[PDB]
Symmetry: C3
Subunit: 149 residues, 3 copies
Amino acid sequence: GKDEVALLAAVTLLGVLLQAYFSLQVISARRAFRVSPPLTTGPPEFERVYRAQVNCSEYFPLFLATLWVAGIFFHEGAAALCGLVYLFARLRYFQGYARSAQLRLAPLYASARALWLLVALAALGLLAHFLPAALRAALLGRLRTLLPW
Amino acid sequence: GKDEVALLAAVTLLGVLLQAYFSLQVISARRAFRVSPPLTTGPPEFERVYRAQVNCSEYFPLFLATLWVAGIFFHEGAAALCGLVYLFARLRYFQGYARSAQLRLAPLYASARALWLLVALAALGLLAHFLPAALRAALLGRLRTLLPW
Amino acid sequence: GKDEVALLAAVTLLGVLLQAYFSLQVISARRAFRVSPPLTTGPPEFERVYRAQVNCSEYFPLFLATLWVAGIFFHEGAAALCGLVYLFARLRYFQGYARSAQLRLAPLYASARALWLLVALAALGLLAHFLPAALRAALLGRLRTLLPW
Ligand SMILES: CCCCCCCCCCCCO[C@@H]1O[C@H](CO)[C@@H](O[C@H]2O[C@H](CO)[C@@H](O)[C@H](O)[C@H]2O)[C@H](O)[C@H]1O
Ligand SMILES: CCCCCCCCCCCCO[C@@H]1O[C@H](CO)[C@@H](O[C@H]2O[C@H](CO)[C@@H](O)[C@H](O)[C@H]2O)[C@H](O)[C@H]1O
Ligand SMILES: CCCCCCCCCCCCO[C@@H]1O[C@H](CO)[C@@H](O[C@H]2O[C@H](CO)[C@@H](O)[C@H](O)[C@H]2O)[C@H](O)[C@H]1O
Ligand SMILES: COc1nc(N(CC(C)(C)F)c2cc(Cl)c(F)cc2F)cnc1C(=O)[C@H]1C[C@@H]1C(=O)O
Ligand SMILES: COc1nc(N(CC(C)(C)F)c2cc(Cl)c(F)cc2F)cnc1C(=O)[C@H]1C[C@@H]1C(=O)O
Ligand SMILES: COc1nc(N(CC(C)(C)F)c2cc(Cl)c(F)cc2F)cnc1C(=O)[C@H]1C[C@@H]1C(=O)O
Ligand SMILES: CCCCCC/C=C\CCCCCCCC(=O)O
Ligand SMILES: CCCCCC/C=C\CCCCCCCC(=O)O
Ligand SMILES: CCCCCC/C=C\CCCCCCCC(=O)O
Ligand SMILES: CCCCCC/C=C\CCCCCCCC(=O)O
Ligand SMILES: CCCCCC/C=C\CCCCCCCC(=O)O
Ligand SMILES: CCCCCC/C=C\CCCCCCCC(=O)O
C-alpha cells in the first residue's frame, strides 16, 4: 500500500530539500549584499537569486500536485523519473539565474518541458481511469447509469 | 481505490491548468509593459495582473489541502463541485483585477465563500470520523481507552 | 483506511486556519496603514506583517508535504505532534515579526527545528520502507531482481 507511493514520497522529500538549498542561497546573498529583513530589494544579483527562489516556491505545489496525480493514475516510475528531471532542471535554473537572467532560460525551458510532461501523464492517467468505463457503459447501453448529464 | 479520488485528482489538474493560464497572462503583460525579469514593479495594470497571479498562487495549496480533506472525509462529489466553483471564481477574480482593483472584489468574495465552504466540509468530514467514535466509547465507558487525555 | 490519516488531515486543516488568521492580520494592517491593493510597500510595521505572511505561505506547502510523508511512512502521532509544534511556532513567529524583526528569530528557529524534525521523520520513514527490503534481497542474493542498477 505505502510502498506503491514510496518513490513519489522520496521525490517529494528531495524537492523539499532542494527548496531548503535555494533558501540557504538567499540567506547567503542577504549577508553578501547587507539586505536586511524585511526588505526584498537590493543589487541586481541579489534580486535575481531572490526571484529564482520565489519562482521555484510558486511552482513547487504545482509540481507536487502533478507528480502525485501522474504517479497514482499513470505509472509511479514514469512520474518519479519525470519529477527528478524537473527538480534537476530547477537547480540549473537557480544557478543560471544567479549568474544572469539570460542563463536561466535554457534550464527554465527544460523544467517547463518536464512539468508539461507531468501534466500530460496526469491527464493520460485520469483519461485511462474514466474513458474505458464510459466506453464500456456506452457499448452496454448503460451510460445514463454511469453519467446522467 | 484510485477512482474513489479520481474526481479530486481531475479538479486538482484543472487548478494546475488555471495557474498555467494566469502565468501566460503575466508573461503577456511583461511584453506589453516591457517589464524585464528580475523586476515585478511597473504600470498599475501590469501590477494588478501580477498581484492577481501571486494571490492565486498563495491560495492554490490551501485550496488543494481542503479539497482533498473535504473529498476524502466528507463526500467526493460535494468537494469536487465546490472546488470547481472556487476555480471559476478565481478565473473571474483574475479577469476582474486585470481591469480594476474594484472589479476583483465580487469574484474574490465568491471565491472566499467557496473556500470557506470547502473548509466547513473538511471540518464536518473530520468531525463525522471522530465524534461518533468518541460518543460510542463514552456510552460504553471505554473513553480512556480511545483517548486518555 | 481514512482514519489512519485523520490526524494528519486535522493538523492540515488547522494549518489552513492559521493561514486564514495571518491573512486577516494583513487585511487589518492594510486599513491601519491605508495600504491599497495593488501595493505591498508601506510603513516598516506593515512591511514586517506582510513579509511574515509571505514567509508562512512559502513554507506552508513544504510543511504539508513533510507532514504527510512523515505521518504515512514514520508514525502518524509523531508527525501530527511535530506539525502542531511547527504551527504554534509559526503563530509566535508572526506575532514576534509584527512587533520587531529581532523578536521573530527565537520562534523562527523553533519552527526551523520543528520542520527539520519532520524532514528527519520523513527520511527515516522512507528508509524504514526501503533499506530492510534491500537488506533482505542482498542476503538472499536477489538484489538485481529488486534493483538492477
Ligand atoms: C477527451 C480526450 C480524448 C482522448 C485523447 C487521447 C490523447 C492521445 C495522446 C497519445 C496517447 C498516449 O501515448 C502514450 O504516451 C506515453 C507518454 O508519452 C508513452 O509512454 C511511455 O513513455 C513515457 C515517457 O514519459 C513513460 O513514462 C511511460 O512509462 C512509457 O510507457 C506511450 O508509449 C504512448 O503510447
Ligand atoms: C466540536 C464541534 C461540535 C459539533 C458541531 C457540529 C456543527 C453543526 C453544523 C451543521 C451540521 C451539518 O449540516 C449539513 O451541512 C451540509 C453542507 O452544508 C449539508 O450537506 C448537503 O449540502 C452540501 C452543500 O455544500 C452538499 O455538498 C452535501 O453533499 C449535501 O449532503 C446537509 O444537508 C446539512 O445537514
Ligand atoms: C542511506 C542512509 C543510511 C542509514 C542511516 C540511518 C540514520 C540513523 C539515525 C538514527 C536512527 C533513528 O533513531 C530514532 O529516532 C527517532 C526520532 O528521533 C526516535 O523516535 C522516538 O522519538 C520521536 C520524536 O520525534 C517520536 O516521534 C517517535 O514516535 C519515537 O519512537 C527513536 O527513539 C530513535 O531510535
Ligand atoms: C516550470 O516553470 C514555469 N512554468 C511556466 N508555465 C506557464 C506557461 C504559460 C509557460 F506554460 C508552466 C505551467 C505549467 Cl502547469 C506547466 F506544466 C509547465 C509550464 F511551463 C511559466 N513559468 C515558469 C517559471 O518558473 C517562470 C517564472 C520563472 C522565470 O520566468 O524565470
Ligand atoms: C480565497 O481568497 C482569499 N481568502 C482570504 N481568506 C482570509 C480571510 C481572513 C478573508 F478569511 C480566506 C482564507 C481561507 Cl482558509 C478561506 F477558507 C477563505 C478565505 F476567504 C483572504 N484573501 C483572499 C485573497 O485572495 C486576497 C489576497 C487577494 C486580494 O485581496 O485581491
Ligand atoms: C521554517 O522556516 C524557514 N526555514 C528555512 N529553512 C532553510 C534553511 C537553509 C535555514 F534550512 C528550512 C527549510 C526546511 Cl525544508 C526545513 F525543514 C527547515 C528549515 F529551517 C529557512 N527560512 C525559514 C523562514 O521562514 C525564513 C524566511 C523567514 C524569515 O527569515 O523571517
Ligand atoms: C537551522 C535554523 C535556521 C533558521 C533560519 C534563519 C533565517 C533568517 C535569519 C535572518 C537574520 C537577520 C538579517 C540581519 C539584518 C540586520 O541585522 O540588520
Ligand atoms: C468506439 C466508439 C463507439 C461509441 C459507442 C457509443 C454508442 C451509442 C451512444 C448512444 C447513447 C444513448 C443511449 C442512452 C441509454 C443509456 O446509455 O443508458
Ligand atoms: C513552454 C515553455 C515556456 C517557458 C516559460 C517562459 C518564461 C519566461 C520568459 C521571460 C523572457 C525574458 C523577458 C525579456 C527581458 C529583456 O529581454 O530585457
Ligand atoms: C448524547 C450525549 C451523551 C454523552 C455521554 C457521556 C457520558 C459520560 C462521561 C463520563 C466519562 C468518565 C468515565 C471514565 C471511564 C472510561 O470512559 O474509560
Ligand atoms: C469573508 C470574505 C472576505 C474576502 C477577502 C477580502 C479581501 C480584500 C479586501 C481589500 C479591499 C480594498 C482595500 C481598499 C483600497 C482603496 O479603497 O483605495
Ligand atoms: C549487514 C550488512 C550485510 C550486507 C550483505 C550484502 C551482501 C552481498 C553484496 C553482493 C551482491 C552482488 C551479487 C549479485 C546477485 C544478486 O543479488 O542478484
